[PDB]
Structures are given as structure tokens and as C-alpha cells.
């Protein structure tokens, strides 16, 4: 299961920074659930492969450059020469992502969300992850360094006695 | 043709696509210039023709940013003066230079 938070600004209210995040079971072809928080009031929804495969066929275009621009677009995975638009509409709850260039957008995708009916779980969860991801980042960061030293250290060893057995 | 039937027509082959007049003419011409200009260009460009009583429908495929641009040029059978004043006058002007 895995799972990734981007940051957005979405062009309705560009002041505010609302997280996006997309979780999937093995890859992003089987689906998703997407679930979009501004802080206070989230909202949640799934995307089966149907979808996915329709939306696929009506945009007249392979389905892995498909994927990878999906990837590209939601996971952050942006590089420098692109630019997309998030948009969503609360009263209709609507959500749709575009691709700009040059003065010329693209509907790349659209869904649509249902909101949750107590923010506060969603939430703490997502804080949860979070914070259990930086937990576990560090522990592995400390244990390399901790390899590293002594790995420089033998080295440094091994040379020193090199060089007194080839003067030998 | 002028604007109105070049976004009617945008509007209607590229559903997802919502980009004004001038810079849907500026990607045509990016894209078809290099073509016409030399080829063995590496640019992605597939053409096709087909055929009515009377119109050509020529189909161009393309991508920019990776992504689809689908053109359809409706061409009717050019009028009488078009074509002598394209190609009947000035190839006798060039036969009558390269005979000097």
C-alpha cells in the first residue's frame, strides 16, 4: 500500500495551500483513493480502473503515457518545463486538473468527491503518517552514518599497515 | 478560413483543449511550417487524406508537450482563377525566364 501528500494551490482561492493526497494498492493503474484537506474541512473519494481506462479512451492517447502524466501531475512528480492547474469547485464538489502551455490548457482529468463527515480523523491521520515517516527516516539515516564511520575508519586501518607492508 | 469556424472547430476535434484562436493558429503553423519547410525533421507529425464526390478531407495528427492536436482541413475544389493564377501563369513565366 503506498501513498503520497502533495501541496496545491488551487486557482479558485489562490492564497491558501490545500494538501492532496493519493494512496493506491500496488500501482496507480488499479486505482485510488484521493482525498484533498484545506486544514478544516476535508473531502474523500475513490477511483476504480474503469474510470480511469474511459477517461483513457476519450482522451485519444496510450494508457501508460496516460499513467505517467497522472503520475506526473498528482504525485509531485513534476519537472521543470510544465506547469499544471488544480481546480475544484465546493459548491458543486467537483475536482479537475489541467495542463497549461503557452495559453493552452488541458482537462486532463476529472473527479468527483463526497465530503467527510468529521474532518478531525482524516486529519490526525494524515499528521499520523507524517510524522511516523519522519520517525522512521531518521532511524535509518543514523544507523548508515553510524556504518559509514566505521567503515572510514577501517579503511583508514587497512591503509596504514598497506603502507608499512609494502615498505617492508 | 477566419476565427470563428477555427475555434468552432477546436472546440468541437479537441474536446479537452481550450486555448483562444491565435495560439491554436500559432501551434499549427509551428508544427506544419517545419514540415513543409524541409523534411526529415524530427518532429511528430502523421498526415492522411481522404475523399468525397467532391472535398478532401486532409487529417493531421500531432503532439505538443506530449500531448494530442488533431486538425481537419474541409478543402472544396479550388475555383478556376485560383488555380490558373497559382500555377498555369507563373509556369509559363518560368519557361519563358529559363528560355532567355
Given at each position: 500500500?503506498?501513498?503520497?501528500?502533495?501541496?496545491?494551490?488551487?486557482?479558485?482561492?489562490?492564497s491558501?495551500?490545500?494538501?492532496?493526497?493519493?494512496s493506491?494498492?500496488?500501482t496507480?493503474?488499479?486505482?485510488?483513493?484521493?482525498?484533498?484537506?484545506?486544514?478544516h474541512?476535508?473531502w474523500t473519494?475513490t477511483?476504480?480502473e474503469?474510470?480511469?481506462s474511459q477517461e483513457?479512451d476519450?482522451?485519444?492517447?496510450?494508457?501508460?503515457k496516460?499513467?505517467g502524466?497522472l503520475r506526473?501531475?498528482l504525485?509531485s512528480?513534476?519537472?521543470?518545463?510544465?506547469?499544471?492547474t488544480?481546480n475544484?469547485?465546493?459548491?458543486?464538489?467537483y475536482?479537475?486538473f489541467?495542463?497549461?502551455?503557452k495559453?493552452?490548457?488541458?482537462r486532463?482529468?476529472?473527479?468527483?468527491?463526497?465530503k467527510?463527515?468529521?474532518?478531525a480523523?482524516v486529519?490526525?491521520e494524515?499528521?499520523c503518517?507524517?510524522?511516523?515517516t519522519?520517525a522512521?527516516n531518521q532511524?535509518?539515516?543514523?544507523?548508515?552514518?553510524?556504518?559509514?564511520?566505521?567503515?572510514?575508519?577501517?579503511?583508514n586501518?587497512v591503509?596504514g599497515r598497506f603502507?608499512?607492508?609494502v615498505?617492508? | 478560413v477566419?476565427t470563428?469556424?477555427?475555434?468552432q472547430?477546436?472546440?468541437?476535434?479537441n474536446?479537452?483543449l481550450?486555448?483562444?484562436?491565435?495560439?491554436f493558429?500559432?501551434?499549427?503553423?509551428?508544427?506544419?511550417?517545419?514540415?513543409?519547410?524541409?523534411?526529415?525533421?524530427?518532429?511528430?507529425?502523421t498526415?492522411?487524406?481522404?475523399?468525397?464526390?467532391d472535398?478532401?478531407?486532409?487529417?493531421?495528427?500531432s503532439?505538443?508537450?506530449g500531448l494530442?492536436?488533431?486538425?481537419n482541413?474541409?478543402?472544396?475544389?479550388?475555383?478556376?482563377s485560383?488555380?490558373?493564377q497559382?500555377?498555369?501563369?507563373?509556369?509559363?513565366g518560368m519557361?519563358?525566364a529559363?528560355?532567355?
Amino acid at each position: 500500500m503506498e501513498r503520497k501528500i502533495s501541496r496545491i494551490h488551487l486557482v479558485s482561492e489562490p492564497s491558501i495551500t490545500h494538501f492532496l493526497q493519493v494512496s493506491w494498492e500496488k500501482t496507480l493503474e488499479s486505482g485510488f483513493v484521493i482525498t484533498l484537506t484545506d486544514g478544516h474541512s476535508a473531502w474523500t473519494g475513490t477511483v476504480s480502473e474503469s474510470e480511469i481506462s474511459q477517461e483513457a479512451d476519450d482522451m485519444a492517447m496510450e494508457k501508460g503515457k496516460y499513467v505517467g502524466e497522472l503520475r506526473k501531475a498528482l504525485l509531485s512528480g513534476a519537472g521543470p518545463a510544465d506547469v499544471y492547474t488544480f481546480n475544484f469547485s465546493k459548491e458543486s464538489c467537483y475536482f479537475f486538473f489541467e495542463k497549461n502551455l503557452k495559453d493552452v490548457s488541458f482537462r486532463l482529468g476529472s473527479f468527483n468527491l463526497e465530503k467527510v463527515e468529521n474532518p478531525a480523523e482524516v486529519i490526525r491521520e494524515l499528521i499520523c503518517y507524517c510524522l511516523d515517516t519522519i520517525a522512521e527516516n531518521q532511524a535509518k539515516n543514523e544507523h548508515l552514518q553510524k556504518e559509514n564511520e566505521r567503515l572510514l575508519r577501517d579503511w583508514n586501518d587497512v591503509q596504514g599497515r598497506f603502507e608499512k607492508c609494502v615498505s617492508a | 478560413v477566419d476565427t470563428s469556424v477555427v475555434s468552432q472547430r477546436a472546440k468541437e476535434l479537441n474536446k479537452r483543449l481550450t486555448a483562444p484562436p491565435a495560439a491554436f493558429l500559432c501551434h499549427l503553423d509551428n508544427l506544419l511550417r517545419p514540415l513543409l519547410k524541409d523534411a526529415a525533421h524530427p518532429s511528430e507529425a502523421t498526415f492522411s487524406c481522404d475523399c468525397v464526390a467532391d472535398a478532401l478531407i486532409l487529417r493531421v495528427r500531432s503532439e505538443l508537450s506530449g500531448l494530442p492536436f488533431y486538425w481537419n482541413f474541409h478543402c472544396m475544389l479550388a475555383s478556376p482563377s485560383l488555380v490558373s493564377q497559382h500555377l498555369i501563369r507563373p509556369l509559363m513565366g518560368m519557361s519563358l525566364a529559363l528560355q532567355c
